[PDB]
Amino acid sequence: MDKFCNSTFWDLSLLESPEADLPLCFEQTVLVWIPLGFLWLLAPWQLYSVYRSRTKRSSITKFYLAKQVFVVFLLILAAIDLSLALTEDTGQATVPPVRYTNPILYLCTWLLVLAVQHSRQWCVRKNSWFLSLFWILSVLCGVFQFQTLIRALLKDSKSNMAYSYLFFVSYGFQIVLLILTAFSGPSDSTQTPSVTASFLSSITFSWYDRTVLKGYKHPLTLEDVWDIDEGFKTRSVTSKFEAAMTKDLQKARQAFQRRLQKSQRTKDYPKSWLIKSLFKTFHVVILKSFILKLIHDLLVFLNPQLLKLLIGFVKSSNSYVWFGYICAILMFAVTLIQSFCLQSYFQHCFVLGMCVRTTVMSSIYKKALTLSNLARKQYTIGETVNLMSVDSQKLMDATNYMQLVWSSVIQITLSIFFLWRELGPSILAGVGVMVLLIPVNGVLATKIRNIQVQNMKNKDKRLKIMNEILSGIKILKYFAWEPSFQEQVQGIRKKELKNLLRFGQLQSLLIFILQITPILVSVVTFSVYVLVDSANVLNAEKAFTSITLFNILRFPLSMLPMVTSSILQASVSVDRLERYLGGDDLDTSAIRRVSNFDKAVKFSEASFTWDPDLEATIQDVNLDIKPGQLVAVVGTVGSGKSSLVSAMLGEMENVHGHITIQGSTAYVPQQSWIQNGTIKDNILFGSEYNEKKYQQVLKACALLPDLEILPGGDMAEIGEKGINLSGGQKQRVSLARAAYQDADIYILDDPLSAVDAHVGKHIFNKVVGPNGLLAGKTRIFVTHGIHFLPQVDEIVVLGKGTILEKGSYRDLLDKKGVFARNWKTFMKHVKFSIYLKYLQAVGWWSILFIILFYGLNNVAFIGSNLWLSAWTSDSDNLNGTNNSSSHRDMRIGVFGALGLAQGICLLISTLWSIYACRNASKALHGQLLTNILRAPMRFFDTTPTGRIVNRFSGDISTVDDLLPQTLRSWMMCFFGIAGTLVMICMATPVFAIIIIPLSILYISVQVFYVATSRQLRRLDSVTKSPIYSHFSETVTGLPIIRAFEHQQRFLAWNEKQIDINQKCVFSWITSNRWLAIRLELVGNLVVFCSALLLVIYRKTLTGDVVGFVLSNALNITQTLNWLVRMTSEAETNIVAVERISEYINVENEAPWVTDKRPPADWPRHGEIQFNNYQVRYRPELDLVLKGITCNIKSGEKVGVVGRTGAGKSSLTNCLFRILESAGGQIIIDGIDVASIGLHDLRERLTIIPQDPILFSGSLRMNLDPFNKYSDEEVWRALELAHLRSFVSGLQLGLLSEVTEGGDNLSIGQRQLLCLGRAVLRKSKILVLDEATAAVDLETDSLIQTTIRKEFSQCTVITIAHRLHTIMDSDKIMVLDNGKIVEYGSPEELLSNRGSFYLMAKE
Ligand SMILES: CC(C)CCC[C@@H](C)[C@H]1CC[C@H]2[C@@H]3CC=C4C[C@@H](OC(=O)CCC(=O)O)CC[C@]4(C)[C@H]3CC[C@]12C
Ligand SMILES: CCCN(CCC)S(=O)(=O)c1ccc(C(=O)O)cc1
Ligand SMILES: CCCN(CCC)S(=O)(=O)c1ccc(C(=O)O)cc1
């Protein structure tokens, strides 16, 4: 052990000296076999694994050649070393055996290295963990020999120069080899760099650099985010989940069947298989993350020990200089290793969470396409979309939290043990305090969650009322109702503000508890430890290692209740998900899709039922249809024709009797379903584009005139936003899609509901007629009209869920029996300006005082640490300072006082912040709501309603929820950083200089991160939204998809969308880890520079200063990273204030009241005069009304029907001053609208909208929200509207609840209510507007009679497009191209040489 080197093996005497150097024998002994030992103990395994499983990949690039060249240079160097050693035999007496046995080992090990490097070419990771770790170990274990040789040669020791020079060259080449191994290999551009990067890069996430640079120069486009590897793509993980889930689902299903049969001898579903299956399918990543976290946790408790060693070294005045530096270097190395481990664990955990969300969403979709009818009925579209949107996120969060709920326990236990070893059994006081603080955290978390749910509900109701307000802003501005509809939502917002303030107070309390736990624990533990006994003393090692352990334990202590609460929530979410997935699949035994048969349709005594709990809807049926034969099944309402079609599709359950169907089928229902996108893609429906067939199906249907009518043309847009296509157009496009799909059989279910006579007849003749495009294709038609009955070739009559007889129209006219009576019954007819705006909303005094009080908190904290330093120092002297109860009591009291001052200052800061942010949100929403209203109608016409609704929902929610927390967190992080830096610089002022470059470095990283992160965030928001929406689109129209047999196409599309979102979210996760590695390196650099400065100045500052400098420099590693992430979040969610301020500054119309007031009756019950008028719908675009002048007398029923131009509809808009009059004005009995107010004039003028809309709520304020009319007057008003009967049958009174939809307040009721409102307005000027011919004639007759009998004395306008109801007008006005050429009564109009206008009487 010593004879083989001819030198001293171990000698601690050299170490125990100011200039210490390790013995050369041990140095060439152990520091040489350690890297070679690591290499030779694993090289066979790596070589075998690579050579056994390998492809034919092989290339020779610059890197492979360079690494091989340098390794053979190492080979040559070891060879010449051996040559020199053997030659020196005659130089000396007997060379030591080491001098000539090391070169042989180096030769063999470099041959092994050459083989390893060559073998790596087969694999895909060129520089894997083995080689990089070997190089790192070699460099680290050789730096000792390098320094020893250089130190020996330094002191003029001219001995064996050649060997030293050769070792220097070999070490330099090893350094360059490690440098090369760090670099990522050249890329094949067929895989994402995450899988082809070198081990050091994959550890340090430097392979992301390119993307970040790509984000800084130009905005990131969805094509610039690298794809994910095939491991995480939704198809692969979903297949793995299904494989590992089928067995568990079968076991749970059999157990559920056994339980049900035992109970019987709906709330029970096969459960407790989702968690088992997910764990079984992800156990590998679960284990990798668990081991990585365990290593990091065992590695996080080395920093306090190193700090204790450093304090002990500085305290001793005879300590060796060569120490201390070793402690600082070790602290840097441990922090680096721990940061690498932690970030890799985070990447593993987050990617596992994202994969869990992917597999759950994809399994949801795959189940939605085969769910049985009953299970589909048990849910709803909104609820199921919410399930996929929310429960999957809950499961992802639970996955992220499960790997941490155990690491927190390990960290707490180890930290408790180490605190015990430091401070004796007196840490139980700290244990008690910080355990009593845990149920408080749990309770606060639960209360916060409940208040958040209540806030969500209130925000939903506010969104609903806001959307209703914005949809019908037209009539709202017409009737001058803005103050009332503003006050209602103002009250709702006040209630939401109260709830939000409560939530903010609870969050502030929770964060105050988290921030004050370490201070309270420190005070209590130190006080109890000193007071419990006089023997034990508090020195700088115990106190500051204990503070470091308290800081280590603060987070996992406060992250237990949150994780627990989230786990108990995900429990219910998992139960819901596995209740959905466990529902049985739909049955296909009855409906057999036989490949080849006769007539393609056979009803083998089928008996289908909507619900087994009820009587069979249809039973004992028998019908066969020849191929190519049109069948028009008809019957009474509710007979079961729609039920018959559903049974044909197989969307219903049956008791007995199978149905045999052959060939492909197409189907169109009465309720047409339209996907999001283009009309073209709707028509193709995933089939190949064919211009000929496309043109044919446009010609066959009525779509070309509609397409030319459409604004966007063939592409245009439809769905979601769309253009609000009419029902007839939807039916037409669905019929066209069915025709294009060219199936063998067609199932038409009332596709001509909102279709006129001639157009529907043409469509039938050209599509489903004898000469239609589907002559060779059989069709089963459901119809209600009689025009198409003569064209049927096989008509079946359906009654009470049972067919009666078959036949054709010839049978109809021949039998004169059942068919005759049936037919007879049938036809009977950013920049700082935005931050300034938000802060000004907050209030400058409030932010000034918040900043001042947080600064006072940090000053108190620095004072507390200085006092602890002095308290620990007083033990070293022991020259009368101690051994007195007064001194110890004063120390304890002042320490407690400083802790209390810090606590109350921080609490005052946070409470003031909460109140200021609440006030700011209130003011911002008030301003935005006030200014959106009273805005001119042009702004509403241009901007879509969805845009303003999103501005009121999402941006206001951001401003009220995520902006205060982000700004407070930024201030917290920044003042933590400033306190720590000004407390490190208080000991060694030289450190101030190192702030100059470090900050610059930090700044650089931040900039790059921001310039990418924003974009990634945006990309996520752009791609997450479609998935959910598509799910709705594929779950509302499930019968259509099942009929067309296009299931796999929809499944593939959903998988594609999931992958497109997955790549964005994965790139975001990696960007977070990239920034975290960089900034944890910056914080670690801060702690290492501080430790080096403390060691250098060890002869000036005592050990207590080292303790309180390092114990806080160790806490800065994460604060920098979180400061940058909070800066990025503040930049991301400040755009809400930007948009709100953009919408506040919108233009406003004429003011409410312009000083001058009208008399008691502004209309003066008299005439009106139109002077020279020059008015356009929007300014300087195109004048509409030009060169018109007229005078309408009192009580005149003046009607105007000009032409098809917009000039017909302009007058009303010009009568309420909605359109500003550029030329002339309007005189009404000497009263000019120009020189008078606006809202007062609109309030006392009436108008019937052409498209009236309803306001949600009651019926009293939907009629008169101002409540300025007595209930008797309102009742009389409905009495002339004869709506008294409807409300009397409904909830009696004026305050009956009303809502949208046809359930309540049907179209006739709506028209009656509008007429009543108009007649009770009681203004002498009446303006009408009619645009729809679908209104019932009785309603028109009654409103005309009541107008003529009540409003005859009042002037009326009657803007009516129809001609058959205007001859009764007293006067008729005609306006052409914006000009009037005639004036007089209808008799005078027809007196002009005979029908000179409105000639067309039909
Ligand atoms: C992305 C989601 C998970 C939001 C995460 C919130 C964190 C980014 C915020 C919330 C609480 C903040 C922490 C709360 C307390 C502090 C104490 C601070 O150290 C001190 O100030 C000493 C204690 C004292 O001053 O009394 C270091 C920053 C830190 C960890 C803050 C860093 C940023 C945190 C973790
Ligand atoms: C929602 C997860 C909660 N966590 C558990 C992770 C295993 S977490 O520890 O608090 C954390 C850490 C780091 C980041 C980040 O870098 O964005 C986010 C969250
Ligand atoms: C949400 C905050 C996340 N951080 C805490 C900052 C105070 S963190 O630095 O990223 C971190 C650190 C350590 C552990 C662990 O030990 O499990 C987890 C997360």
> 3-state secondary structure string, 413-428?
HHHHHHHHHHHHHHHH
For residues 1057 and 1027, give the distance between their C-alpha atoms in angstroms, rounded to a whole number: 6
Q: Indicate the residue type of 1102.
A: T
Residues 666 and 572 in one domain: no
- Judged on CB neighbours under 10 Å (0-12, 13-18, 19+), 1270 is exposed
Distance between CA atoms of 1299 and 575, rounded to whole angstroms? 35
**Considering the domain boundaries, does residue 210 fall inside one?**
no
Read off the amino acid at residue 89: D
What residue owns the CA closest to ligand 1's atom 31?
Answer: 973
Report the distance separating Cα 183 and Cα 207, nearest Å.
Answer: 10
Query: Which residue from 448, 1119, 1125, 1133 has its CB within 8 A of the most atoms of ligand 1, so it is best to mutate?
Result: 1119
Nearest one of 505, 504, 510, 500 to 956, comparing CA atoms: 500
Candidates 581, 642, 649, 589; CA nearest to 1041 is 649
Residue 1074, in any domain of the structure: yes
Would you say the C-alpha torsion 767, 772, 777, 781 has a positive or negative sign? positive
Q: Residues 6 or more apart from 725 whose CB is under 8 A from it?
A: 674, 718, 733
Residue with tokens 């604060």: 1119
Helix (H, G, I), strand (E, B) or coil at 352: helix
731 Cβ inside 6 Å of ligand 2: no
Closest ligand by atom to 1129 CA: 1
Max CA distance (Å), the chain:
144
Say how many Å lie between the CA of residue 514 and the centre of ligand 1: 9
Q: Which two tokens stand for residue 69?
A: 């060249």
Q: State if residue 399 touches ligand 2 by the CB under 6 angstroms criterion.
A: no
Residue whose CA is at the smallest distance from ligand 2 atom 10:
559
Ligand 3 in reach of 409 Cβ (< 6 A): no
Could you tell which of 294, 302, 349, 555 is best to mutate to test the pocket of ligand 3, judged by most ligand atoms within 8 Å of the CB? 555
The token duo for 1308 is 């006739």
Phi then psi for 1066, rounded to 5 degrees? -65, -40
| Cα(209)–Cα(197) distance, integer angstroms | 12
The dihedrals phi and psi of 362, each to the nearest 5 degrees, come to -65, -40
Closest to 1109 in 3D by CA, of 1213, 1299, 1237, 979: 979
Continuous H helices in 742-767:
757-763
973 CA distance to ligand 1 middle (Å): 6
Tell me, in angstroms, the distance from the centre of ligand 1 to residue 156's CA. 56
| DSSP class of 766 | I
The burial class, CB within 10 Å (0-12 / 13-18 / 19+), for 1100 is exposed
Ligand 2 and 1072: CB distance under 6 A:
yes
Would you say 937 and 477 are in contact if contact means Cβ atoms under 8 Å apart?
A: yes
Residue 404 C-alpha to ligand 2 middle, in angstroms? 9
Distance from chain centroid for Cα 84: 70
The number of domains in the chain is 5
Cβ of 1077 closer than 6 Å to ligand 2, yes or no, is no
Note whether 1070 and 924 are same-domain residues.
yes
**Whose Cα sits closest to atom 12 in ligand 1?**
969
CA distances from 99 to 6, 80, 96, 291 (A): 10, 12, 6, 42
What's the rounded Cα separation, in Å, for the pair 826 and 784?
A: 8
DSSP letters, 488-553, are: HHHHHHHHHHHHHHHHHHHHHHHHHHHHHHHHHHHHHHHHHHHHH-SS----HHHHHHHHHHHHHH
Residue 760 domain flag: yes
CB 1257, CB 1251: distance < 8 Å: no
The 3-class secondary structure across 1091-1147, one letter per residue, is HHHHHHCCCCCCHHHHHHHHHHHCCCHHHHHHHHHHHHHHHHCCHHHHHHHHHHCCC
Q: Which two tokens stand for residue 464?
A: 């609903």
- Report the alpha-carbon distance of residue 514 to residue 1297 in Å, rounded: 49
Distance, CA 446 to ligand 1 centroid (Å)? Answer: 21
Is the same domain home to 467 and 496?
yes
Q: Phi/psi of residue 167, each to 5°? A: -65, -40
Residue from 355, 365, 432, 435 nearest 395 by CA: 355
Decide: 220 and 1015 in contact? Cβ < 8 Å: yes
Measured in Å, residue 1117 CA sits from the centre of ligand 2 at 15
Contacts of 496 (CB under 8 A, 6+ apart): 455, 458, 459, 462
Instruction: Pull the structure tokens for residue 166.
Output: 């050769």
Ligand 1 centroid from CA 919, angstroms = 24
Residue 601 in domain:
yes
Distance between CA atoms of residues 1067 and 1059, nearest Å: 12
Q: Is the CB of residue 16 less than 8 Å from the CB of residue 110?
A: no
CA proximity to 666, closest of 803, 791, 768, 596: 768
Task: In whole angstroms, give the CA distance from residue 875 to residue 470.
Answer: 74
Q: For residues 18 and 160, state if they share a domain.
A: yes
Do 1353 and 1256 lie in a common domain?
no
Please indicate, yes or no, whether residues 1049 and 1181 belong to a single structural domain of this protein. no
> Quick check: is 229 in a domain?
no
Could you tell me where the beta strands, DSSP code E, fall in 721-874? 745-749, 778-782, 797-799, 802-803
Q: Is 848 exposed, middle or buried (0-12, 13-18, 19+ CB in 10 A)?
A: exposed
Q: Whose CA is nearest to atom 24 of ligand 1?
A: 515
Q: How far apart are the first and last CA of the chain?
A: 121
Angle at 77 between CA 73 and CA 83, to 5 degrees: 145
Please state the φ and ψ torsions of residue 662, each to the nearest 5 degrees: -120, 150
- 1394 burial class (0-12, 13-18, 19+ CB within 10 angstroms)? exposed
558 lines ligand 2 (CB under 6 A): no
Q: Are residues 704 and 720 in the same domain?
A: yes
Minimal CA–CA distance to 1173: which of 1184, 1164, 1161? 1184
DSSP-derived 3-state class of residue 1145: coil
Best CA proximity match to 32, nearest among 146, 111, 113: 146
CB of 403 sitting under 6 A from ligand 3 = no
3-state secondary structure of 1330: strand
Rounded CA-CA distance 1096/18 in Å is: 15
Please list every protein residue whose CB sits less than 6 Å from any atom of ligand 1.
511, 514-515, 519, 861, 902, 969, 972-973, 976, 1115, 1119, 1122, 1126
> Which ligand lies nearest the alpha carbon of 350?
2
What does the alpha-carbon distance between residue 950 and residue 960 come to, in Å, rounded to a whole number? 15
CB 110 within 8 A of CB 74: yes
Distance CA(1391)–CA(1385), nearest Å, equals 10
Phi-psi region of 205 (alpha: psi -120 to 50; beta: other; left: phi over 0): left
One-letter amino acid at 1234 equals A
Whether 838 contacts 917, CB under 8 Å: no
Q: Are 1088 and 1116 in contact (CB under 8 A)?
A: no
What angle, 0 to 180 degrees and rounded to 10, lies between the N-to-C axes of helices 322-368 and 303-315?
170
Taking alpha carbons only, the member of 757, 558, 593 closest to residue 664 is 593
Instruction: Indicate whether 29 and 141 sit together in one domain.
Output: yes
Q: Under a CB-based contact definition with an 8 Å cutoff, are residues 864 and 899 in contact? A: yes
How many angstroms is it from 402 CA to the middle of ligand 2?
Answer: 12
Count of other CB atoms within 10 angstroms of residue 1077: 22
Buried b (16+ CB within 10 A) or exposed e, 1057-1074: bbbbbbbbbbbbbbbbbb
Q: Cα separation of 1402 and 1399, whole Å?
A: 9
The 3-state DSSP composition of the chain as helix, strand, coil percent (nearest 5) reads 65, 5, 30
- Taking CA atoms only, the protein residue closest to ligand 2 atom 12 is 346
**Residue 1389, number of CB atoms within 10 A of its CB:** 19
Contact of 580 with 249, CB cutoff 8 Å: no
- Residue 986 to residue 77: CA distance in whole angstroms: 52
Q: Is 1294 helix (H, G, I), strand (E, B) or coil?
A: coil
Candidate from 972, 1013, 1080, 1119 with most ligand 1 atoms within 8 A of CB, to mutate: 972
Residues recorded for the chain: 1402
Contact assessment for residue 461 and residue 882, using Cβ atoms and an 8 Å cutoff: no
Structure-derived torsion over alpha carbons of residues 142, 148, 152, 155, reported in degrees to the nearest 10: 120
Give the residue from 804, 826, 848 where a domain finishes. 826
The last residue of a domain, from among 1322, 1354, 1378: 1322
Tally of CA atoms within 13 A in the half-sphere of 17 that contains its CB: 9
Least Cα distance to 44 among 116, 105, 107 occurs for 116
Beta bridge partners of 802: 799
Tokens of 472: 């019908």
Please indicate, yes or no, whether residues 1240 and 1265 belong to a single structural domain of this protein: no
**Which of these, 1070, 1076, 1069, 1087, lies nearest to 1005 by C-alpha position?**
1076
d(CA 1026, CA 12) in angstroms, rounded, equals 70
- Tell me, in Å, the resolution of the deposited structure: 3.5
CA–CA distance, 881 with 537 (Å, rounded to integer):
13
Whether residue 1162 sits in one domain with residue 1140 = no
- Counting Cβ atoms within 10 Å, is residue 122 exposed (0-12), middle (13-18) or buried (19+)? middle
Distance CA 979, CA 958 (A): 30
Query: Which structure tokens are listed for 841?
Result: 């909303």
Cα–Cα distance, 569 to 573 (Å, whole number): 7
Q: Which residues contact 297 (CB under 8 A, 6 or more apart)?
A: 407, 410, 411, 414
Alpha helix stretches (DSSP H) within 187-321: 199-204, 209-217, 234-264, 274-299, 303-315
CA distances from 916 to 503, 922, 927, 969, 1123 (A): 14, 10, 17, 15, 22
1383 lies in some domain: yes
Q: What is the DSSP string of 1367-1395?
A: TTSSEEE-EETTEE---B-HHHHHHTTT-
999 three-state secondary structure = helix
Q: Which residue's C-alpha comes closest to atom 18 of ligand 1?
A: 976
Alpha carbons 909 and 975: distance in angstroms, whole number: 12
The CATH number for 754's domain is: 3.40.50.300
**At CA 753, angle to CA 749 and CA 754, rounded to 5?**
145
Tell me, yes or no, whether 586 lies in a domain. Answer: no
| CATH label of the domain that carries residue 1012 | 1.20.1560.10
The CB density around residue 897, as the number of other CB atoms within 10 Å, is: 15
761 and 677 in one domain?
yes
Q: How far is CA 198 from the centre of its chain?
A: 33
Binding site, by residue number, is: 635-642, 1202-1209
Cβ-in-10-Å burial (0-12, 13-18, 19+) of 365 comes to buried
What's the token pair of residue 83?
């040559």
Distance in angstroms (rounded) separating the CA atoms of residues 1274 and 1297: 16
Of the candidates 1317, 1312, 1322, the one whose C-alpha atom is nearest the C-alpha of residue 1353 is 1322
Q: Does the CB atom of residue 354 touch ligand 2 within 6 A? A: no
Query: Among 973, 980, 1079, 1086, which is best to mutate for testing ligand 1, by the most ligand atoms less than 8 A from CB?
Result: 973
In Å, how far from its chain's centre is CA 801?
48
Instruction: Tell me how far apart the alpha carbons of residues 918 and 927 are, in angstroms, rounded to a whole number.
Output: 14
Among all ligands shown, which has an atom nearest to the Cα of 407?
3
Rounded CA-CA distance 1171/1153 in Å is: 24
Annotated binding site for ATP: 635-642, 1202-1209
Give the list of residues 6+ apart from residue 902 with CB closer than 8 angstroms, or none. 519, 857, 860, 861, 864
Q: Please name which of 798, 844, 832, 846 lies closest in space to residue 818, comparing C-alpha atoms.
A: 798
* Angstrom distance (rounded) from CA 242 to CA 1381: 78
Nearest CA among 632, 774, 764 for reference residue 693:
774
Q: Is 217 a member of any domain?
A: no
585 forms beta bridges with 371
In order of 57, 323, 530, 1106, the CA distances from 540 in angstroms are: 61, 19, 14, 9
Task: State how far the Cα of 898 lies from the Cα of 693, in Å rounded to an integer.
Answer: 85
Ligand 2, atom nearest to 1072 Cα: 16
Indicate the SS3 state at residue 749.
Answer: strand
Angle between helices 832-842 and 885-932 (to 10 degrees): 110
Q: What is the CA radius of gyration of the chain?
A: 42
Question: Do residues 950 and 928 lie in contact, with contact meaning Cβ atoms separated by under 8 Å?
Answer: no
Q: Reduced to 3 states, what is the DSSP secondary structure of residue 1300?
A: coil
Q: Within 13 Å of residue 331, how many CA atoms lie on the same side as its CB? A: 30
CB 1315 within 8 A of CB 1346: yes
- 665 beta partners: 745
- The helix (run of H) or strand (run of E) holding residue 717 is none
CB 1076 near ligand 2, within 6 Å: yes
Q: Whole-angstrom Cα distance, residue 709 to residue 716?
A: 11
Residue 390: DSSP 8-state: I
Quote the CA–CA distance of 173 and 1063 in Å, as a whole number: 40
Tell which of 1296, 1322, 1348 closes a domain.
1322
CA distance 1234 to 394: 60
Structure tokens at 1339: 């309603």
Residue 1297 phi, psi dihedral angles, 5° rounding:
-70, 140
- What is the experimental method? cryo-EM
Distance CA 46, CA 120 (A): 9
List, in sequence order, every residue forming a beta bridge with 1297; answer none if it has no partner. 1258
One domain, residues 601 and 576:
no
Mapped onto helix, strand or coil, the DSSP state of residue 266 is coil
Beta strands in 1164-1262 (DSSP E): 1168-1170, 1174-1176, 1183-1186, 1190-1192, 1198-1200, 1226-1228, 1231-1232, 1246-1247, 1257-1258
DSSP state of 767: I
C-alpha 109/C-alpha 103 separation (Å) is 10
DSSP 87-145: HTTTTSS---HHHHHHHHHHHHHHHHHHHHHHHTTTSS-SS-HHHHHHHHHHHHHHHHH
Q: Is the CB of 555 under 6 A from ligand 3?
A: yes
**Atom 10 (ligand 1): residue with closest C-alpha?**
969
Environment class of residue 1084 by beta-carbon count within 10 Å: exposed (0-12), middle (13-18) or buried (19+)?
A: buried
Q: Are 153 and 23 in contact (CB under 8 A)?
A: no
Residue whose CA is closest, atom 17 of ligand 1?
Answer: 515
Q: Which domain holds residue 1387?
A: 1151-1245+1324-1395
No. of helices (H) and no. of strands (E), the chain:
49, 28
φ/ψ of 353, rounded to 5, equals: -60, -45
Spatial CB neighbours of 814, under 8 Å, sequence gap ≥ 6: none
Residues 1272, 1320: Cα–Cα separation, whole Å: 12
Residue pair 539/422 in contact (Cβ under 8 Å)? The answer is no
